[PDB]
Write a protein that binds this DNA or RNA. Structure first.
Length: 341
RNA sequence: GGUGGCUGCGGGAAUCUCAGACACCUUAAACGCUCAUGGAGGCUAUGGUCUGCGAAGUGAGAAUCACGCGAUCGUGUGAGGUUCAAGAGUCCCUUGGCGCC
DNA sequence: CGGTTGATCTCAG
DNA sequence: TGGGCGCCAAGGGACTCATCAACCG
């Protein structure tokens, strides 16, 4: 019924790691090259290249001797790089006429650390099993964390998070059954820096303690960043410290995402209606006094997870249009009930 | 002999076992390590700390178990307990930290 | 036959 | 002497989430 991405962890060997690195590099190369080519074409001509023209020129590029060493890369990687470039342009053109928010012009990119390429599924090109994954030009890659999949595999996003930590997101149109009737009809949740969530239905208020990971591991993060900054760019030990900092950040985000997953799933399995307010953290983060706390708390991710898991599992999130915490939570529940009825 | 964690594998997290170093003495906090090189600095609240018994840096290396093949150690494959939960991609924008001015 | 590749599609600034 | 310029990460906010006939070893 629903799209769903099963994120597993790859353990590619030397050759497969080299090929994943080469594929990410060539995907970035074609992204930059065709952004430059489209800009040059729109400057020289009345209109720039569209998706089909870019694909045809990419084919001519691969078949040519100028960059024939890009043919040894998975085709869907380059094609979806071009698709991402074209959807960048589509996002830019979404609301140029509108003035509510300016979507920035698509720019270049210069060797970030998180490089992901997508590969599509054509007549059994992706095969998921007990402990392996089937990728087009890689072959069999030893995975772990392989969940239970009972749907058709749409695409596989091969990622890279550290110098030696590769994930892979396998998308499938799985059937997601609606959960049984919830124990309680409706409840409202109030966010907060001191207490992460105060959720109540009028009879109890199981306040959820705020972990505040980012401030909690702020000293080790500061030490990691400082050890990085004393190191020369383009150095092996610079790369080592960079990976250390990246993994510290990955641990922080992992803990935050696990906490948010557990809390959102608990709410959706406990209440039929989960009322909350449409807080805009990107506006509050301009206040440097509370910005670090709002960044760490991640209200936006919490609300996104609550809402989409409600959509999957047959729950309704009645977001409100834009003591203290307890009364705010009760008012949120009342407003959600009013909106629903 | 007791206790706490630092680093590494165990998909994430909490635990938990193992391993590369430790520290404190029944008490809870703090810190990953080995070798080569480099020459006065690194961290922190006017000062304390580690340091010519070597500082920032720079390069390499080890960091679970079984089995297969090499002359204990390299090379390949396989396994990794436990409870909870697991939807991502794209682009753009923003701010968090550090360093220098 | 199993795997890989090139063409499809519907806006602009 | 905090704003500015370099890097390294995160979150926030919309949308989007592919298929098939030919070619090749």
């Amino acid at each position: 019924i629903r799209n769903k991405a099963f994120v597993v962890r790859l353990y590619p060997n030397a050759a497969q790691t080299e090929l994943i690195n080469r594929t990410l590099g060539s995907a970035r190369f074609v992204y930059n090259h065709f952004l430059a080519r489209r800009i040059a074409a729109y400057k020289e001509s009345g209109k720039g290249l569209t998706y089909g023209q870019t694909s045809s020129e990419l084919t001519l590029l691969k078949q040519a001797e100028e960059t024939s060493w890009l043919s040894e890369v998975d085709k869907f990687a380059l094609q979806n790089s071009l698709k991402n470039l074209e959807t960048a342009y589509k996002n830019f053109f979404r609301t140029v006429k509108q003035s509510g928010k300016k979507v920035g012009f698509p720019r270049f990119r210069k060797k970030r650390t998180g490089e992901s390429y997508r590969t599509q599924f054509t007549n059994n090109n992706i095969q998921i099993g007990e402990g392996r994954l089937k990728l087009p030009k890689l072959g069999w890659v030893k995975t772990k964390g392989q969940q239970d999949i009972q749907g058709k595999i749409l695409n596989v996003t091969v990622r890279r998070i550290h110098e030696g930590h590769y994930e892979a997101s396998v998308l499938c149109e799985v059937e997601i059954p609606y959960l049984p009737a919830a124990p309680k009809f409706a409840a409202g949740v109030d966010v907060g820096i001191k207490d992460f969530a105060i959720v109540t239905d009028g009879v109890r208020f199981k306040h959820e303690q705020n972990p505040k990971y980012y401030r909690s591991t702020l000293k080790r993060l500061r030490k990691a960043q400082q050890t990085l900054s004393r190191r020369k760019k383009g150095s092996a030990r610079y790369g080592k410290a960079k990976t250390k900092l990246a993994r510290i950040h990955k641990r922080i985000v992992n803990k935050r995402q696990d906490f948010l997953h557990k809390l959102t799933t608990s709410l959706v399995r406990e209440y039929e209606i989960i009322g909350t307010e449409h807080l805009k953290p990107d506006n509050m983060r301009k206040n440097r006094r509370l910005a670090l706390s709002i960044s760490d708390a991640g209200w936006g991710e919490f609300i996104r997870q609550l809402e989409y898991k409600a959509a999957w599992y047959g729950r309704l999130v009645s977001k409100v249009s834009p003591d203290r915490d307890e009364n705010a939570a009760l008012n949120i529940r009342r407003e959600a009930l009013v909106a629903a009825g």
